[PDB]
Amino acid sequence: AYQLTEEQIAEFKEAFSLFDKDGDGTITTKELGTVMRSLGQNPTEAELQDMINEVDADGNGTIDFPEFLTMMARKMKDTDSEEEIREAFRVFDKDGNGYISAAELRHVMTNLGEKLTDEEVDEMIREADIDGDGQVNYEEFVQMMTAK
């Protein structure tokens, strides 16, 4: 379970701000799309609108901070749950080909606000890459994400 502590609220605000690039306190479909596109995805307007509709209690077409937190309360689970690890793999695997490359990892990490140095990227890939193909598949990813 997550708590509404000052520290946690600040973390959620950081996430909200990633989307709310104009700082107007609302996340639009345009803003959702810009972030997803930065991760190699190209969702339809329908897909973007559906995400808003999940928590758009006032029906104004955008997500405000309370609605965003309602989404987090509904969706968020343990960091090592099966569904969070599969969803994390899909995000890092920009092209959906079943392997996370160094280029993908670097791109996704910086566009989500946690830029890695090339040394941090190479280190993560090297250590997670058990089969030696230079990339990280789902099974390797699970191992990396669960190993303590």
């Binding site: 996430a15 968020m76 960091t79 995000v91 990490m109 941090e120």
Partner: peptide, 19 residues
């Protein structure tokens, strides 16, 4: 280790659930 800690940071602020 450090890259993994950063991934955990992204998870705990909900960015995997959003993306």
């Amino acid at each position: 280790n450090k890259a993994l800690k950063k991934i955990r940071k992204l998870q705990k602020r909900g960015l995997i659930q959003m993306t």
